Design a protein around this ligand. Structure first.
Ligand SMILES: O=P(O)(O)C(Nc1cncc(-c2ccc(OC3CC3)cc2)c1)P(=O)(O)O
Ligand SMILES: O=P(O)(O)C(Nc1cncc(-c2ccc(OC3CC3)cc2)c1)P(=O)(O)O
Ligand SMILES: [Mg+2]
Ligand SMILES: [Mg+2]
Ligand SMILES: [Mg+2]
Ligand SMILES: [Mg+2]
Ligand SMILES: [Mg+2]
Ligand SMILES: [Mg+2]
Lengths: 343, 343
């Protein structure tokens, strides 16, 4: 497994990331304390996930750059850009945990819930974002792809924030939202909030690094990668309720938070008028027994079996798209990523 | 007054800003609702201030570009970059109001306190930031200063966030912070959190637009502008307690929030050991009568008279720096800005 090959080296590069985001400022002692808080934020929030998004940059970089061109410094730029994707994820999750009222993430208490943090985490999150652009500058400023990468990271943030905005608008707290939970809406939300940054962004970064900047090549990749990202979010929604928390590292809140989850969309498609009422009376509320009634309804409509069927169909579909749109890129780029997310 | 001259035109340009941040996406109807929320965020949070930071870009642009070079399109790029500074301010204040537990801003209830907003304002704030880079791209992508401006806005966010981090670390909630409130610390905080973005950023943007990109020219400007920004923050601290709220548009929270304010630093420099105890027992707490005891202590040490003296000295100092460091730039660039902030 090519991801598992490259993991140790990727993670080991983190202490260099952190040294450089501190060595950058030994000329300014007055900001010493702030830099120490930054280190602590990086350590708590950039570590402990699966690193799939960041590793995708590195794996794809290997497969796209001719190996005589993979010198020490280029590899280091690749690992650094991979870490920039992980920093963007860390930015997003720290903020999302506050907005979703979350408890745990990656198996530990959410950063904002730590005593002494609280809403200061808003600034913490934005420092994570700022780190991306400081790394790009320190490591890629003289490369012909520098501007492409900056604009890709910015554009990806914007798309993700537009996605989040739709996610929030579709889920107002304390209000019966069932009319709004449709398939068309669901697919838009997830395209913008997850698919661009989690799937297009890292492969696109590696494309740009390898000097593949053509509009058609990017557009072809993107047809594959946005569909994979949609499946990824549906799986994330399913696991929010049916996953095992010692594996997912987090406790699901989608029903309480009134979310336009794939599950609730599937539910609505199938429920009898009576079941529609159960959903209505119980969805989007804090009360544990209300949450449980919803979950029972989902199990009564074999939504877990529906998810298992959908996963097999989506896998066939994604593979068909790799057949249609991968060339001229190595199909292994996309296949290694599909292996990481299916089963 | 050159600021007052250019104001009407600046403000009128806002509806174009908003049209372009919406016309940009008529090819993507699925995100329609999100774009409507964006418009609403822009309207509530980018409007109602004094526009000094954004206007500084435009005023400075006029004074630095030779007028035969001030065509219709260049002016429009100037007003747009001015609006990018105002968007950055709007980003910062929306987030800062949540973190400082604020009530009002610019004479209306803070965005996050509106019913139905709450911590969704975190995403709202970040959309404001994203707008900057979308405007730079749409209006300045083909200009030789494009990258300079992107890197200046990013670097300015980073510095401001580092400043904020020091502000928060120096003011932990529910803890007696008096030992940490020193002059040296105070000056660092304000340099980073306010001075870079409020004073260096807008003049630097206009410098870059006029093709003045030299390291020494930027460094000279910056010596002037960071000192002005320090005075600006001290005045902001003074007004937090002693300003009239129908003028400031906001209610001050520095004493409750346990802030390393210029006032508390001045207080510590002057208090008898007994007064030091009053401060200690009353600073940083929610209780209205505790706040009032602190204010009475400040008045007992004639801190308002100390501020009035300091303002006159700082004004003389800034003017001396304009004499030393303005050339080769027109001194009117800096003088018009000092007129806007002193008295
Ligand atoms: O990991 P999670 O299950 O919590 C997913 N988290 C996730 C997925 N896709 C995008 C985000 C995200 C990104 C930025 C956000 O706001 C910050 C920009 C200000 C909020 C959420 C967060 P979700 O809440 O959508 O099920
Ligand atoms: O307008 P205010 O009196 O409230 C001043 N506001 C202000 C001045 N300088 C910088 C900020 C600022 C910028 C960004 C912030 O956090 C966002 C980056 C995430 C928080 C505060 C806010 P302050 O709270 O320092 O007296
Ligand atoms: Mg979440
Ligand atoms: Mg979420
Ligand atoms: Mg989820
Ligand atoms: Mg404030
Ligand atoms: Mg503040
Ligand atoms: Mg203030």
């Amino acid at each position: 497994d090519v991801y598992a090959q490259e993991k140790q080296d990727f993670v080991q590069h983190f202490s260099q990331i952190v040294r450089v985001l501190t060595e950058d400022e030994m000329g300014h002692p007055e900001i010493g304390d702030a830099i120490a808080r930054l280190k602590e934020v990086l350590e708590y929030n950039a570590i402990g996930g699966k690193y799939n998004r960041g590793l995708t940059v590195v794996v794809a970089f290997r497969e796209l750059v001719e190996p005589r061109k993979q010198d020490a410094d280029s590899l280091q730029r690749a690992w650094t850009v991979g870490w920039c994707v992980e920093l963007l994820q860390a930015f997003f999750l720290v903020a999302d945990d506050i907005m979703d009222s979350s408890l745990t993430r990656r198996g530990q208490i959410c950063w904002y819930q730590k005593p002494g943090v609280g809403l200061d985490a808003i600034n913490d999150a934005n420092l994570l974002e700022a780190c991306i652009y400081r790394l790009l500058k320190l490591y890629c400023r003289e490369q012909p792809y520098y501007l492409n990468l900056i604009e890709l990271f910015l554009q990806s943030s914007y798309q993700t924030e537009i996605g989040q905005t739709l996610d929030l608008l579709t889920a107002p707290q304390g209000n019966v939202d069932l009319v709004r939970f449709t398939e068309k809406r669901y697919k838009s939300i997830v395209k913008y909030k997850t698919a661009f940054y989690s799937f297009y962004l890292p492969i696109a970064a590696a494309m740009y690094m390898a000097g593949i900047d053509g509009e058609k090549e990017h557009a072809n990749a993107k047809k594959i990668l946005l569909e994979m990202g949609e499946f990824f979010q549906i799986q994330d929604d399913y696991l929010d309720l049916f996953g095992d928390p010692s594996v997912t590292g987090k406790i699901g809140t989608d029903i309480q938070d009134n979310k336009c989850s794939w599950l609730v969309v599937q539910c609505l498609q199938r429920a009898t008028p009576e079941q529609y009422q159960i959903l209505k009376e119980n969805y989007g509320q804090k009360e544990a027994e209300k949450v449980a009634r919803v979950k029972a309804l989902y199990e009564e409509l074999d939504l877990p079996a529906v998810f298992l069927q959908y996963e097999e169909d989506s896998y066939s579909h994604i593979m068909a798209l790799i057949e249609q749109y991968a060339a001229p890129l190595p199909p292994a780029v996309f296949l290694g990523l599909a292996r990481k997310i299916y089963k």
